[PDB]
Design an enzyme around this catalytic site. Structure first.
Site, PDB file in Angstrom:
ATOM      1  N   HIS A  12       0.847  -1.183   0.078  1.00  0.00           N
ATOM      2  CA  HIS A  12       0.113   0.036   0.060  1.00  0.00           C
ATOM      3  C   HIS A  12       0.875   1.080   0.177  1.00  0.00           C
ATOM      4  O   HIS A  12       0.403   2.298  -0.362  1.00  0.00           O
ATOM      5  CB  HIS A  12      -0.975  -0.053   1.146  1.00  0.00           C
ATOM      6  CG  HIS A  12      -1.934  -0.914   1.065  1.00  0.00           C
ATOM      7  ND1 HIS A  12      -3.013  -1.165   0.290  1.00  0.00           N
ATOM      8  CD2 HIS A  12      -2.386  -2.052   1.943  1.00  0.00           C
ATOM      9  CE1 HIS A  12      -3.923  -2.056   0.308  1.00  0.00           C
ATOM     10  NE2 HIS A  12      -3.318  -2.977   1.368  1.00  0.00           N
ATOM     11  N   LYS A  41      -4.490  -9.977  -7.447  1.00  0.00           N
ATOM     12  CA  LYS A  41      -5.137  -9.026  -6.500  1.00  0.00           C
ATOM     13  C   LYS A  41      -6.451  -8.082  -7.196  1.00  0.00           C
ATOM     14  O   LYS A  41      -5.912  -7.301  -8.210  1.00  0.00           O
ATOM     15  CB  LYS A  41      -4.162  -8.311  -5.520  1.00  0.00           C
ATOM     16  CG  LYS A  41      -4.844  -7.657  -4.242  1.00  0.00           C
ATOM     17  CD  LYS A  41      -3.782  -6.995  -3.307  1.00  0.00           C
ATOM     18  CE  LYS A  41      -4.398  -6.767  -1.974  1.00  0.00           C
ATOM     19  NZ  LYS A  41      -5.148  -5.456  -2.041  1.00  0.00           N
ATOM     20  N   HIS A 119      -3.802  -2.762   7.162  1.00  0.00           N
ATOM     21  CA  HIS A 119      -4.800  -3.010   6.266  1.00  0.00           C
ATOM     22  C   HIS A 119      -5.623  -1.874   5.770  1.00  0.00           C
ATOM     23  O   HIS A 119      -5.593  -0.920   6.457  1.00  0.00           O
ATOM     24  CB  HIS A 119      -6.149  -3.893   6.936  1.00  0.00           C
ATOM     25  CG  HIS A 119      -7.244  -3.891   6.128  1.00  0.00           C
ATOM     26  ND1 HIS A 119      -7.795  -4.552   5.042  1.00  0.00           N
ATOM     27  CD2 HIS A 119      -8.195  -3.430   6.502  1.00  0.00           C
ATOM     28  CE1 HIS A 119      -8.967  -4.356   4.779  1.00  0.00           C
ATOM     29  NE2 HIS A 119      -9.339  -3.571   5.444  1.00  0.00           N
ATOM     30  N   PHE A 120      -5.710  -1.582   4.424  1.00  0.00           N
ATOM     31  CA  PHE A 120      -6.251  -0.646   3.737  1.00  0.00           C
ATOM     32  C   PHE A 120      -7.910  -0.858   3.673  1.00  0.00           C
ATOM     33  O   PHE A 120      -8.266  -1.664   3.008  1.00  0.00           O
ATOM     34  CB  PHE A 120      -5.634  -0.164   2.658  1.00  0.00           C
ATOM     35  CG  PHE A 120      -6.241   0.926   2.170  1.00  0.00           C
ATOM     36  CD1 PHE A 120      -7.399   1.217   1.306  1.00  0.00           C
ATOM     37  CD2 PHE A 120      -5.423   2.277   2.289  1.00  0.00           C
ATOM     38  CE1 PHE A 120      -7.882   2.577   0.923  1.00  0.00           C
ATOM     39  CE2 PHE A 120      -5.884   3.514   1.895  1.00  0.00           C
ATOM     40  CZ  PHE A 120      -6.960   3.434   1.314  1.00  0.00           C
ATOM     41  N   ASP A 121      -8.725   0.068   4.296  1.00  0.00           N
ATOM     42  CA  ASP A 121     -10.126  -0.405   4.367  1.00  0.00           C
ATOM     43  C   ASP A 121     -10.975   0.572   3.332  1.00  0.00           C
ATOM     44  O   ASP A 121     -12.018  -0.447   2.805  1.00  0.00           O
ATOM     45  CB  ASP A 121     -10.548  -0.108   5.797  1.00  0.00           C
ATOM     46  CG  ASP A 121     -11.990  -0.774   6.206  1.00  0.00           C
ATOM     47  OD1 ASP A 121     -11.759  -2.312   5.921  1.00  0.00           O
ATOM     48  OD2 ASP A 121     -12.877  -0.408   6.345  1.00  0.00           O
TER      49      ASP A 121
HETATM   50  N1  LIG Z   1     -12.412  -5.781   2.765  1.00  0.00           N
HETATM   51  C1  LIG Z   1     -12.177  -4.398   2.760  1.00  0.00           C
HETATM   52  N2  LIG Z   1     -12.600  -3.566   3.696  1.00  0.00           N
HETATM   53  N3  LIG Z   1     -11.284  -4.080   1.983  1.00  0.00           N
HETATM   54  C2  LIG Z   1     -10.614  -5.024   0.908  1.00  0.00           C
HETATM   55  C3  LIG Z   1     -10.290  -4.282  -0.320  1.00  0.00           C
HETATM   56  C4  LIG Z   1      -9.432  -3.135  -0.356  1.00  0.00           C
HETATM   57  C5  LIG Z   1      -8.055  -3.330  -0.295  1.00  0.00           C
HETATM   58  N4  LIG Z   1      -7.536  -3.548   1.057  1.00  0.00           N
HETATM   59  P1  LIG Z   1      -6.282  -4.505   1.555  1.00  0.00           P
HETATM   60  O1  LIG Z   1      -5.786  -5.297   0.192  1.00  0.00           O
HETATM   61  O2  LIG Z   1      -5.464  -3.800   2.536  1.00  0.00           O
HETATM   62  O3  LIG Z   1      -7.087  -5.469   2.429  1.00  0.00           O
HETATM   63  C6  LIG Z   1      -7.831  -6.450   1.740  1.00  0.00           C
HETATM   64  C7  LIG Z   1      -7.813  -7.827   2.934  1.00  0.00           C
HETATM   65  O4  LIG Z   1      -8.210  -7.438   4.100  1.00  0.00           O
HETATM   66  C8  LIG Z   1      -8.977  -8.352   4.321  1.00  0.00           C
HETATM   67  N5  LIG Z   1      -9.766  -7.551   5.793  1.00  0.00           N
HETATM   68  C9  LIG Z   1     -10.950  -6.871   5.671  1.00  0.00           C
HETATM   69  N6  LIG Z   1     -11.096  -6.235   6.708  1.00  0.00           N
HETATM   70  C10 LIG Z   1      -9.948  -6.264   7.307  1.00  0.00           C
HETATM   71  C11 LIG Z   1      -9.586  -5.772   8.546  1.00  0.00           C
HETATM   72  N7  LIG Z   1     -10.625  -4.936   9.167  1.00  0.00           N
HETATM   73  N8  LIG Z   1      -8.473  -5.780   8.956  1.00  0.00           N
HETATM   74  C12 LIG Z   1      -7.530  -6.711   8.434  1.00  0.00           C
HETATM   75  N9  LIG Z   1      -7.692  -7.295   7.157  1.00  0.00           N
HETATM   76  C13 LIG Z   1      -9.181  -7.143   6.755  1.00  0.00           C
HETATM   77  C14 LIG Z   1      -9.795  -8.690   3.339  1.00  0.00           C
HETATM   78  O5  LIG Z   1     -10.262 -10.078   3.589  1.00  0.00           O
HETATM   79  C15 LIG Z   1      -8.757  -8.691   2.117  1.00  0.00           C
HETATM   80  O6  LIG Z   1      -8.344 -10.138   2.420  1.00  0.00           O
HETATM   81  C16 LIG Z   1      -7.464  -1.976  -1.084  1.00  0.00           C
HETATM   82  O7  LIG Z   1      -6.193  -1.732  -1.199  1.00  0.00           O
HETATM   83  O8  LIG Z   1      -8.111  -0.818  -1.438  1.00  0.00           O
END
Ligand SMILES: N=C(N)NCCC[C@H](NP(=O)(O)OC[C@H]1O[C@@H](n2cnc3c(N)ncnc32)[C@H](O)[C@@H]1O)C(=O)O
EC number: 4.6.1.18
Length: 124
Positions: A12, A41, A119-121
Site C-alpha cells: 500500500h 489481487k 490493512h487498507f479499508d
Molecule cells: N475488505 C475491505 N474492507 N477491503 C478490501 C479491499 C480494499 C483493499 N484493502 P487490502 O488489500 O489492504 O485488504 C484486503 C484484505 O483485508 C482483509 N480484511 C478485511 N477487513 C480487514 C480488517 N478490518 N483488518 C485486516 N484485514 C481485513 C480482506 O479480507 C482482504 O483479504 C485496497 O487496497 O483498497
C-alpha cells in the site's frame, strides 16, 4: 517472515507525491509489489504520503471497519492515493488494471504494539 505492518507497506505504501511510472502505473506496481504472484489481487490502493503521515492515521478519527471491527481510522486530511482495479479482460497470470488517481481521506485498520496500519479499508 513478513510482519503485518511490513505487508501493509509492501502492498500500500508508495511515498512519492503522486503515481509515477514508465508505462501503466497499476500494471507495473501490482506486479512489482508481488500482488499478481499467486493471483490478480482484484483491487489495491497505493498511498503516496510519507510512512509517518500514514502511521499517524492510527491516532486520528476512530471509525468502524467495513468488516465490523472497530480498529479502523480515518485520516483528518485528504491524502494522495491511486486506486488499482482489475479490468474485465484481465486474467491471471496476465493481470491488467485500470489506474484511478485521487485525493481522498483514507481509512486503515491498525493493529499491534506499536499500533500501526495493517490493512487498507476504504477511501472517503
Ligand atoms: N475488505 C475491505 N474492507 N477491503 C478490501 C479491499 C480494499 C483493499 N484493502 P487490502 O488489500 O489492504 O485488504 C484486503 C484484505 O483485508 C482483509 N480484511 C478485511 N477487513 C480487514 C480488517 N478490518 N483488518 C485486516 N484485514 C481485513 C480482506 O479480507 C482482504 O483479504 C485496497 O487496497 O483498497
Amino acid at each position: 517472515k513478513e510482519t503485518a505492518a511490513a505487508k501493509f507497506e509492501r502492498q500500500h505504501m508508495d511515498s512519492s507525491t503522486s503515481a509515477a511510472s514508465s508505462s501503466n502505473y497499476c500494471n507495473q506496481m501490482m506486479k512489482s509489489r508481488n500482488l499478481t504472484k499467486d493471483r490478480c489481487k482484484p483491487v489495491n490502493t497505493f498511498v503516496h504520503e510519507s510512512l509517518a503521515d500514514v502511521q499517524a492515521v492510527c491516532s486520528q478519527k476512530n471509525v468502524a471497519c467495513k468488516n465490523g471491527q472497530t480498529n479502523c481510522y480515518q485520516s483528518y486530511s485528504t491524502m494522495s492515493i491511486t486506486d488499482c482495479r482489475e479490468t474485465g479482460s484481465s486474467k491471471y497470470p496476465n493481470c491488467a488494471y485500470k489506474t484511478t488517481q485521487a485525493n481522498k481521506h483514507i481509512i486503515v485498520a491498525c493493529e499491534g504494539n506499536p499500533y500501526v496500519p495493517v490493512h487498507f479499508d476504504a477511501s472517503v
